Assembly symmetry: C2
Homo-oligomer: 178 residues x 2
């Protein structure tokens, strides 16, 4: 009588299939097989396929934010946490471009508002990080956490890495003026 287990198996199997055949090759038969459940069984946990994909992308996204939140709240210097958040964000943008964007579209008919909410949540996490830096003396108190979070959140549309990140951190810390 285990549902938490089965539901999890279906979600992990779905991710595996996608990471294997991409959204285009996804067949519930392989998901059901990898999950070790009947195909009809999956429809007892999820309305349909797009409903299942929706649960998977939401869970993956929830996980990314749980990780960022953990980094932001760790007892560590502002600049170490900032660099850790940016590295994770960069990895996430790549995973999103390569899979979740298509999944989200397929899974939700009206995803734009959900996406806006995620962007707002990311901004709040960076503002929280910035306020911590202000209290630690790493960030100028004169800076608006909100406005500064929006600027930092801007990474993600350029393919430009380790070297790269070090230069970005240098600019975020000191800017370019002598």
């Amino acid at each position: 009588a285990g549902v938490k287990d089965k539901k999890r198996a279906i979600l992990e199997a779905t991710l595996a299939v996608l990471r294997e055949r991409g959204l285009s090759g996804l067949k519930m038969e392989e998901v059901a097989r990898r999950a070790e459940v009947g195909k009809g069984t999956i429809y007892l946990y999820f309305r349909d396929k797009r409903d299942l994909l929706k649960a998977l992308v939401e869970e993956r996204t929830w996980a990314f934010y749980r990780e960022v939140e953990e980094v932001v709240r760790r007892k560590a210097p502002f600049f170490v946490r900032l660099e850790e958040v940016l590295r994770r964000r960069l990895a996430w943008v790549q995973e999103w471009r390569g899979l979740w964007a298509a999944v989200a579209r397929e899974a939700m008919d009206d995803p734009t508002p959900w996406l806006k909410g995620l962007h707002e949540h990311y901004l709040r996490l960076l503002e929280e990080l910035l306020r911590s830096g202000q209290s630690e003396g790493a960030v100028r108190t004169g800076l608006s956490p909100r406005a500064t979070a929006a600027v930092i959140a801007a990474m993600g549309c350029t393919p430009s890495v380790e070297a790269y990140l070090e230069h970005l951190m240098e600019v975020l810390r000191k800017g370019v003026e002598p």
Copy 2:
């Protein structure tokens, strides 16, 4: 009277037809009509509808670069030029998401190789601007022009209070 002149007239007519009929309603016949050239002329210049759209994105893009190249080589303070370039870049990205992205996509099976080539021209222009800023004394000489150009290209992704705050971070970061 001039290959590049007729090419241009054809592309402008193409954009007109696209804006008032969509790609679905785009016919070479209709483009030839607005461009005032024979249908054969259209096909000589552009083999298929796909090469027509490709040429269209290229023209608008190279026109963007000339706009940026103009600010970059302008005799003005480094930060004045940087903000101008970034303001123009933002307007361009908006323009791109609203149309050019889809056009590029229809232009060819795989746009990326060609689009990466564009990211390049912009990067070279930022590098040139940064080297200028370094001679000017507005940009720390220890910064790598290439690396910093890559950073600015990124940080420049998309009310507009945004620009003023972006400039403050680009100029002095967040550290006291």
